[PDB]
Description:
The structure is cut from a larger assembly and holds chains A and B.
Chain A: H1 9-15, H2 18-23, H3 25-37
Chain B: E1 3-4, E2 16-17, E3 35-36, E4 61-62, E5 76-82, E6 90-96, E7 101-106, E8 115-116, E9 140-142, E10 162-168, E11 171-175, E12 181-185, E13 191-192, E14 246-247, E15 250-252
Antiparallel strand pairs in B: 1-2, 3-4, 5-6, 5-8, 6-7, 9-10, 9-13, 10-11, 11-12, 14-15
The structure holds magnesium ion (153 copies).
The site of one magnesium ion (MG) has 2 residues of chain B, from loops.
Chain B binds seven RNA strands through strand 5, strand 14 and strand 15.
Amino acid sequence: MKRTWQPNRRKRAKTHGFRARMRTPGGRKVLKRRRQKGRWRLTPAVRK
Amino acid sequence: AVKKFKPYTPSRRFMTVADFSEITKTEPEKSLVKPLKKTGGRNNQGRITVRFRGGGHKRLYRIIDFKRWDKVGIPAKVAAIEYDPNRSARIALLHYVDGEKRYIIAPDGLQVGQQVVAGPDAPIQVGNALPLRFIPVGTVVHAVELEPKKGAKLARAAGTSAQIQGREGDYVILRLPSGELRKVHGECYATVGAVGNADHKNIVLGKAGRSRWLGRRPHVRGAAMNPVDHPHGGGEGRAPRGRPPASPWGWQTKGLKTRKRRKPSSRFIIA
RNA sequence: AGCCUACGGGCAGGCGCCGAGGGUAGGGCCCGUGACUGGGGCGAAGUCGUAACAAGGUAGCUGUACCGGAAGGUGCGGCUGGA
RNA sequence: AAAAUGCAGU
RNA sequence: CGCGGGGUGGAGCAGCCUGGUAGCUCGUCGGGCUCAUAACCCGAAGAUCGUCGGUUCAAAUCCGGCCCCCGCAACCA
RNA sequence: UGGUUCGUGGAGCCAUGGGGGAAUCUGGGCGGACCACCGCCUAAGGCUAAGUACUCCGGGUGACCGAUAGCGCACCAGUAC
RNA sequence: GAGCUAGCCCUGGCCAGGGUGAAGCUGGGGUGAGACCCAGUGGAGGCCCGAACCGGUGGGGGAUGCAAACCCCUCGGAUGA
RNA sequence: GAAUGCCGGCAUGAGUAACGAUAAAGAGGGUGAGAAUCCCUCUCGCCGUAAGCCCAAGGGUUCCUACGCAAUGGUCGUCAGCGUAGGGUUAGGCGGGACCUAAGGUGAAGCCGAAAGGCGUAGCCGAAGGGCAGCCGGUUAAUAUUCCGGCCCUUCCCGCAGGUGCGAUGGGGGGACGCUCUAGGCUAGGGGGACCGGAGCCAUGGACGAGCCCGGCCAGAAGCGCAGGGUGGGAGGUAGGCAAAUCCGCCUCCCAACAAGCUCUGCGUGGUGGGGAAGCCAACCCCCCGAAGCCAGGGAGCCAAGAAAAGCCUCUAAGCACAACCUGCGGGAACCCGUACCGCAAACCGACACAGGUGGGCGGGUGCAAGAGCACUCAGGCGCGCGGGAGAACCCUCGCCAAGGAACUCUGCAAGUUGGCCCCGUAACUUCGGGAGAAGGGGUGCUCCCUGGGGUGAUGAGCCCCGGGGAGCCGCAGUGAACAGGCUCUGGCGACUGUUUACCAAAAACACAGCUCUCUGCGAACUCGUAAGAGGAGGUAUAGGGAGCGACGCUUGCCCGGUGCCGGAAGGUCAAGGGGAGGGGUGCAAGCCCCGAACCGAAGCCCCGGUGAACGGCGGCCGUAACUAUAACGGUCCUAAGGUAGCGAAAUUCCUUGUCGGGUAAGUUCCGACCUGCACGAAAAGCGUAACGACCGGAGCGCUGUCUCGGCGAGGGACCCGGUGAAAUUGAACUGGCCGUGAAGAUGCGGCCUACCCGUGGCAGGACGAAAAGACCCCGUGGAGCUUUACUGCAGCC
RNA sequence: CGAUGUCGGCUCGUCGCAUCCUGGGGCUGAAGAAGGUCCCAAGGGUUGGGCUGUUCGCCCAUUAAAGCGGCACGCGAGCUG
Lengths: 48, 271
Ligand SMILES: [Mg+2]
Ligand SMILES: [Mg+2]
Ligand SMILES: [Mg+2]
Ligand SMILES: [Mg+2]
Ligand SMILES: [Mg+2]
Ligand SMILES: [Mg+2]
Ligand SMILES: [Mg+2]
Ligand SMILES: [Mg+2]
Ligand SMILES: [Mg+2]
Ligand SMILES: [Mg+2]
Ligand SMILES: [Mg+2]
Ligand SMILES: [Mg+2]
Ligand SMILES: [Mg+2]
Ligand SMILES: [Mg+2]
Ligand SMILES: [Mg+2]
Ligand SMILES: [Mg+2]
Ligand SMILES: [Mg+2]
Ligand SMILES: [Mg+2]
Ligand SMILES: [Mg+2]
Ligand SMILES: [Mg+2]
Ligand SMILES: [Mg+2]
Ligand SMILES: [Mg+2]
Ligand SMILES: [Mg+2]
Ligand SMILES: [Mg+2]
Ligand SMILES: [Mg+2]
Ligand SMILES: [Mg+2]
Ligand SMILES: [Mg+2]
Ligand SMILES: [Mg+2]
Ligand SMILES: [Mg+2]
Ligand SMILES: [Mg+2]
Ligand SMILES: [Mg+2]
Ligand SMILES: [Mg+2]
Ligand SMILES: [Mg+2]
Ligand SMILES: [Mg+2]
Ligand SMILES: [Mg+2]
Ligand SMILES: [Mg+2]
Ligand SMILES: [Mg+2]
Ligand SMILES: [Mg+2]
Ligand SMILES: [Mg+2]
Ligand SMILES: [Mg+2]
Ligand SMILES: [Mg+2]
Ligand SMILES: [Mg+2]
Ligand SMILES: [Mg+2]
Ligand SMILES: [Mg+2]
Ligand SMILES: [Mg+2]
Ligand SMILES: [Mg+2]
Ligand SMILES: [Mg+2]
Ligand SMILES: [Mg+2]
Ligand SMILES: [Mg+2]
Ligand SMILES: [Mg+2]
Ligand SMILES: [Mg+2]
Ligand SMILES: [Mg+2]
Ligand SMILES: [Mg+2]
Ligand SMILES: [Mg+2]
Ligand SMILES: [Mg+2]
Ligand SMILES: [Mg+2]
Ligand SMILES: [Mg+2]
Ligand SMILES: [Mg+2]
Ligand SMILES: [Mg+2]
Ligand SMILES: [Mg+2]
Ligand SMILES: [Mg+2]
Ligand SMILES: [Mg+2]
Ligand SMILES: [Mg+2]
Ligand SMILES: [Mg+2]
Ligand SMILES: [Mg+2]
Ligand SMILES: [Mg+2]
Ligand SMILES: [Mg+2]
Ligand SMILES: [Mg+2]
Ligand SMILES: [Mg+2]
Ligand SMILES: [Mg+2]
Ligand SMILES: [Mg+2]
Ligand SMILES: [Mg+2]
Ligand SMILES: [Mg+2]
Ligand SMILES: [Mg+2]
Ligand SMILES: [Mg+2]
Ligand SMILES: [Mg+2]
Ligand SMILES: [Mg+2]
Ligand SMILES: [Mg+2]
Ligand SMILES: [Mg+2]
Ligand SMILES: [Mg+2]
Ligand SMILES: [Mg+2]
Ligand SMILES: [Mg+2]
Ligand SMILES: [Mg+2]
Ligand SMILES: [Mg+2]
Ligand SMILES: [Mg+2]
Ligand SMILES: [Mg+2]
Ligand SMILES: [Mg+2]
Ligand SMILES: [Mg+2]
Ligand SMILES: [Mg+2]
Ligand SMILES: [Mg+2]
Ligand SMILES: [Mg+2]
Ligand SMILES: [Mg+2]
Ligand SMILES: [Mg+2]
Ligand SMILES: [Mg+2]
Ligand SMILES: [Mg+2]
Ligand SMILES: [Mg+2]
Ligand SMILES: [Mg+2]
Ligand SMILES: [Mg+2]
Ligand SMILES: [Mg+2]
Ligand SMILES: [Mg+2]
Ligand SMILES: [Mg+2]
Ligand SMILES: [Mg+2]
Ligand SMILES: [Mg+2]
Ligand SMILES: [Mg+2]
Ligand SMILES: [Mg+2]
Ligand SMILES: [Mg+2]
Ligand SMILES: [Mg+2]
Ligand SMILES: [Mg+2]
Ligand SMILES: [Mg+2]
Ligand SMILES: [Mg+2]
Ligand SMILES: [Mg+2]
Ligand SMILES: [Mg+2]
Ligand SMILES: [Mg+2]
Ligand SMILES: [Mg+2]
Ligand SMILES: [Mg+2]
Ligand SMILES: [Mg+2]
Ligand SMILES: [Mg+2]
Ligand SMILES: [Mg+2]
Ligand SMILES: [Mg+2]
Ligand SMILES: [Mg+2]
Ligand SMILES: [Mg+2]
Ligand SMILES: [Mg+2]
Ligand SMILES: [Mg+2]
Ligand SMILES: [Mg+2]
Ligand SMILES: [Mg+2]
Ligand SMILES: [Mg+2]
Ligand SMILES: [Mg+2]
Ligand SMILES: [Mg+2]
Ligand SMILES: [Mg+2]
Ligand SMILES: [Mg+2]
Ligand SMILES: [Mg+2]
Ligand SMILES: [Mg+2]
Ligand SMILES: [Mg+2]
Ligand SMILES: [Mg+2]
Ligand SMILES: [Mg+2]
Ligand SMILES: [Mg+2]
Ligand SMILES: [Mg+2]
Ligand SMILES: [Mg+2]
Ligand SMILES: [Mg+2]
Ligand SMILES: [Mg+2]
Ligand SMILES: [Mg+2]
Ligand SMILES: [Mg+2]
Ligand SMILES: [Mg+2]
Ligand SMILES: [Mg+2]
Ligand SMILES: [Mg+2]
Ligand SMILES: [Mg+2]
Ligand SMILES: [Mg+2]
Ligand SMILES: [Mg+2]
Ligand SMILES: [Mg+2]
Ligand SMILES: [Mg+2]
Ligand SMILES: [Mg+2]
Ligand SMILES: [Mg+2]
Ligand SMILES: [Mg+2]
């Protein structure tokens, strides 16, 4: 039936955004963590 | 006056709405600096703080004059009596001669085109406001302030009304609608007469809906929840509570007094 | 489409209306009877009290309402058919 | 103030 | 099958913890008061203390075995 | 109340959230309650190398591994997924 | 982590067709005046039937499925909470 | 060599199940190395409120073209959404942005918090809402309101002419609002035509026919009509719009008003531009139906009373009047992003080309009462990416059945009957609405004749919309197929519509209007937060929070001993702290240090009293009536008080299938009764109750393959052949019966018996078959949720 | 207990005999017909409903009779629940 993943761009960008991250101390420390691991994307890459 | 319906459908037989002859004359509220974006929302910064709120018909706000001492001595003609979704009483719209217009919790009797005013002198009668001190010991009165220059706060719902019980110096004693005998400062204003729409207390919602149209979501009994939720909850098989009626938060609900103890607000009470 | 024919006609035969009654369905009135149940009338010497009749030992009666093993009691009002 | 009852027929 | 409480004059109950005394209401019997009956007044009479054994100097009383009574249990399957 | 070895213990010292509240050397704290002796030391401003720590980084080594080991990755790996 | 789900807030959209026929008005009757009674008009309702849409009654099938909740027949709401 | 071990490889099950909707195929041409599967054509079937068109979201080159077939495609592939390469997406007017504001977010000022950070005014951000200028054609292999053609617009800048007190972030108006019902005109859309325009056709017995067949429009400035939507003009005063105003707003004054004018739309018409069927390698007209769309800010009614801001008018402030606006007309200027393609799906969410899920618009025609339903069908799109035979059992889905007719069974579960529209005609009971579609009947097709109103016209023909009567025809049958209630009686529970355990429970559970109790006088009580702040509420006792009950009707007894809550300026106790009698350590001392009794000291608790729609409770044993029997009466013990009404073998009754009565041939169920109620009882309400119910029980009628009891038949599998080809499982196996034996249920030991070797289709007795380190049970000084008068703490509160 | 699915029903049976019928047969308080009891004997039979989840019973209507037990209270990789 109507599964859990209902893709929306404005959502994804706004929830897991690079800006959204930077805005919370918890969110800032997420990036810090990723950059430090070498991930190629930090913020779930989207596009509009 | 309360209108009743025929049984042409259950939940109707019983239902009864408010008679709107008192109002009439004007339906749409006064566009003019009078309505506002009345913001629905059943709770503060996030969590709900008043369970079962919500739903309910869209509603515009009417800013009313809760301190008529604004325009002292300036007399006005009561232009119309309109309906107000925001409250139980009816509000009356009045054009001042000052040009200006504004609303005012429509007192019982106040009639159209009749003139009214407020001042430390106005003819003691329906719709006039004057510092409590100048009002004849006895004469009823609504939209009473509680402290000089802080707006009406007492007696505002259909039928409410306090009575001047007697003077006592800087102060004056009032027997509020609840029956508590309060001492309100002499300067506090208050407009002569009662509130009107007294029939309010008789309308029977009728159906479970309506209760909803008012923005009241079903209210479940503690009894019906589980130990986890409410305290009454739980028990395998319907229960007799289990000593001594309590609220979802703890505190007893049958009799336990709550008003603050050492509230400086005493000293002016009795009842 | 037969018969006798006195031949546009008559009979037989055919179709239709109605039609006794039978059928089905649903109502109404009356009578009988029914576990159980409600009081009622009656029946020589039963059990409990004593309400009423003499200020019946709390005047009586009354419409009503509530209560009580039972008569009855009490409230409100009413009558005198009590003072 | 308080204080009940008296078998059947005759 | 288990864990309980109980048994005493006619009746309904006490004394049984902590032994030597058997208490109360009622009823019963004998007298009064009434024309008489109740009701009232005065005076009594009646109790293997459920049985059997044990303990003690002495047991209804403390101790166990039975015999009858009225309670509560009998759960997961 | 915390810190110390110190868990209220005879509990001093060192900090200090509350109340009260000095003196400037005849001033004032300490020497494990407290007195007295005797002795130490100058609180309520600050600064100060070095010896100490660590290994993203470069180098040298190994009775270290040798592609299921060794870092997760000897390879276009924080990738594919 | 409320892109599922639960509630609420702001703003939009959606609900074939058919039926029943409340309040009101209006005329007639009625009375001292009324209540009221009649037709007509009227078009109410968590009203009725039933598609969309929202469900999930009962049965069967499915059960290494078409599917980690599906399909068939059937059934409830369908101007409202 | 074992850890249901870890990683990897390869086995077995097995050429087995399967190959993803039973909408469906056949053939002839091509192409090629090879074609059931690619291309073409001709038959055939399926969808057609879609299985067709457009738009959004999401996906992201999947688009078009040319080469290709390793793999991907449940088979095949010459094909492709695959690989490789090359093309392809054009905007002042469509959509976003150099506009607006909503929720919400952010946040100068300001408030708060160990830090992190939390609030918060304005402002800012924020869109499917407000605002705003493009229509019809033509082109490409692939883009088009984007390029092109025709017609028509919008801003800005400048010059010019002619106008006027011009001018704000400021003031005012407007923007501007709900739901249900609707008028009058239109348009979209559609149906006809005896008319216009057309290639053609007369077959197979007849028709050269007012024949058949095809099509008879679209867009359109200014002006003009026809529908509407908006709108009083004057002129004086002014205490108001946080006056800066000749604008709003108020009063007063002529005139004027189911209006005119002035405006603004929509629709016709319009110069003119465009398109333009069926057929064999060029008209463009007239009737009729008609919107859920337009005129739109239309109108009525209703109660629950229906965003904001900018654009836009208008008013004045400084300012500035050489500016400036305003109207014209010309010239010029007009950026950024998006635009391919999929888009109910093989390109989106579901690991898959997945029978699931996905918002908005169009959604033709005929018939059936209607309709978005149902059957068929246009347009357009599809036959579902394995096929070919066979015609066993067995399963699925489907059709029919003799006589019987619920005997089936836990249960009529399932299936059958009934089934639309019209007319008759419908009971108890009732809250008078209803029950009611109660039940139970009749009608239903086509043909001819007569005849009634309506709409459009024009009054009159056509064209449509309702009808009424009379004869008559054929069938087994006329809602001739499809969509399409089985009905009644009677209990229980709940009033009722509603809500729930996504994914085993839809209920008698939750909710519900309504009743009661209680809290709360406003910086309310309550909730969230450390706080600031916020909800409560821009409310104010007819209001708000908590609690129980749960429409309505008749009602809701007795017990404050204990418990809770409420009231008690006395008493009793009580911690700091006050107070210091009096004692102690040290000094030679002044002193310094220590203990420390009287008494005074809060809340709380004890204590007094209230309190039941507050927690809660609401008895026993003897006796007695003139037949017995029983006990209205009595005695006695105990209590805080001993269960009232009403109901009662019940969702409650153990004994129990109580015992009577009813229904039945027969009734542990069922209905009515009785009452020794193991163990009903009054807002954890008691007893009832019309109506309602996918709720649970009992009975009848109707009908039936449920059954006596099976039989035949259809199709999709199962079976054979070609093609692709898994799975759990698996110590190894050369894996028979009986009677014993064995850790107690043996293919495997013993004795006897039977037994050539290997498969195929079938059935499930056994392999203590598979699958889950059993849910139950106990064990563990394992764990979690919950509880309270367990312990001990903390928030909170006094 | 790293699972031996647990009542009853339905379907399919098969076995024991301590036999409900039907066949033999001795006693009898067996006249007859019937009955009682015991002996031998399962070869084959051993009904259909009402009530209950029931096994079991109890009834209804028949019968020659309406037997009792075992098979993991036979039988859920056979069904029902
Ligand atoms: Mg969203
Ligand atoms: Mg906020
Ligand atoms: Mg937030
Ligand atoms: Mg509730
Ligand atoms: Mg619950
Ligand atoms: Mg929770
Ligand atoms: Mg709790
Ligand atoms: Mg409870
Ligand atoms: Mg007849
Ligand atoms: Mg009778
Ligand atoms: Mg008397
Ligand atoms: Mg007397
Ligand atoms: Mg008397
Ligand atoms: Mg008595
Ligand atoms: Mg009395
Ligand atoms: Mg009297
Ligand atoms: Mg007597
Ligand atoms: Mg005699
Ligand atoms: Mg005793
Ligand atoms: Mg005795
Ligand atoms: Mg005597
Ligand atoms: Mg003894
Ligand atoms: Mg003795
Ligand atoms: Mg004894
Ligand atoms: Mg137990
Ligand atoms: Mg247990
Ligand atoms: Mg300090
Ligand atoms: Mg010190
Ligand atoms: Mg010291
Ligand atoms: Mg020392
Ligand atoms: Mg220093
Ligand atoms: Mg290095
Ligand atoms: Mg090496
Ligand atoms: Mg090595
Ligand atoms: Mg490695
Ligand atoms: Mg190697
Ligand atoms: Mg959500
Ligand atoms: Mg639609
Ligand atoms: Mg409708
Ligand atoms: Mg009417
Ligand atoms: Mg409805
Ligand atoms: Mg419906
Ligand atoms: Mg649901
Ligand atoms: Mg439905
Ligand atoms: Mg229905
Ligand atoms: Mg709504
Ligand atoms: Mg080993
Ligand atoms: Mg492996
Ligand atoms: Mg096999
Ligand atoms: Mg096979
Ligand atoms: Mg196969
Ligand atoms: Mg397929
Ligand atoms: Mg080739
Ligand atoms: Mg060839
Ligand atoms: Mg979406
Ligand atoms: Mg996109
Ligand atoms: Mg690609
Ligand atoms: Mg090609
Ligand atoms: Mg290939
Ligand atoms: Mg292939
Ligand atoms: Mg392609
Ligand atoms: Mg390609
Ligand atoms: Mg252009
Ligand atoms: Mg903005
Ligand atoms: Mg913030
Ligand atoms: Mg804000
Ligand atoms: Mg918009
Ligand atoms: Mg635009
Ligand atoms: Mg295209
Ligand atoms: Mg162009
Ligand atoms: Mg000027
Ligand atoms: Mg047309
Ligand atoms: Mg022609
Ligand atoms: Mg005017
Ligand atoms: Mg003016
Ligand atoms: Mg035109
Ligand atoms: Mg052409
Ligand atoms: Mg702005
Ligand atoms: Mg101006
Ligand atoms: Mg496109
Ligand atoms: Mg769609
Ligand atoms: Mg897909
Ligand atoms: Mg496919
Ligand atoms: Mg799919
Ligand atoms: Mg159609
Ligand atoms: Mg129809
Ligand atoms: Mg439509
Ligand atoms: Mg359809
Ligand atoms: Mg078709
Ligand atoms: Mg086949
Ligand atoms: Mg048959
Ligand atoms: Mg037949
Ligand atoms: Mg029949
Ligand atoms: Mg029957
Ligand atoms: Mg049977
Ligand atoms: Mg059925
Ligand atoms: Mg049917
Ligand atoms: Mg009847
Ligand atoms: Mg009924
Ligand atoms: Mg009918
Ligand atoms: Mg015909
Ligand atoms: Mg069909
Ligand atoms: Mg059919
Ligand atoms: Mg019952
Ligand atoms: Mg219900
Ligand atoms: Mg419901
Ligand atoms: Mg569920
Ligand atoms: Mg339901
Ligand atoms: Mg369910
Ligand atoms: Mg109060
Ligand atoms: Mg506040
Ligand atoms: Mg309840
Ligand atoms: Mg009391
Ligand atoms: Mg009490
Ligand atoms: Mg008390
Ligand atoms: Mg108190
Ligand atoms: Mg005190
Ligand atoms: Mg108690
Ligand atoms: Mg006797
Ligand atoms: Mg009978
Ligand atoms: Mg019976
Ligand atoms: Mg039955
Ligand atoms: Mg009964
Ligand atoms: Mg009882
Ligand atoms: Mg009770
Ligand atoms: Mg009570
Ligand atoms: Mg109660
Ligand atoms: Mg109830
Ligand atoms: Mg009922
Ligand atoms: Mg329902
Ligand atoms: Mg029956
Ligand atoms: Mg069958
Ligand atoms: Mg067959
Ligand atoms: Mg077949
Ligand atoms: Mg094969
Ligand atoms: Mg062998
Ligand atoms: Mg064996
Ligand atoms: Mg062997
Ligand atoms: Mg085989
Ligand atoms: Mg087997
Ligand atoms: Mg099998
Ligand atoms: Mg197993
Ligand atoms: Mg285990
Ligand atoms: Mg357990
Ligand atoms: Mg533990
Ligand atoms: Mg095992
Ligand atoms: Mg014999
Ligand atoms: Mg014989
Ligand atoms: Mg046998
Ligand atoms: Mg057997
Ligand atoms: Mg057994
Ligand atoms: Mg068994
Ligand atoms: Mg069950």
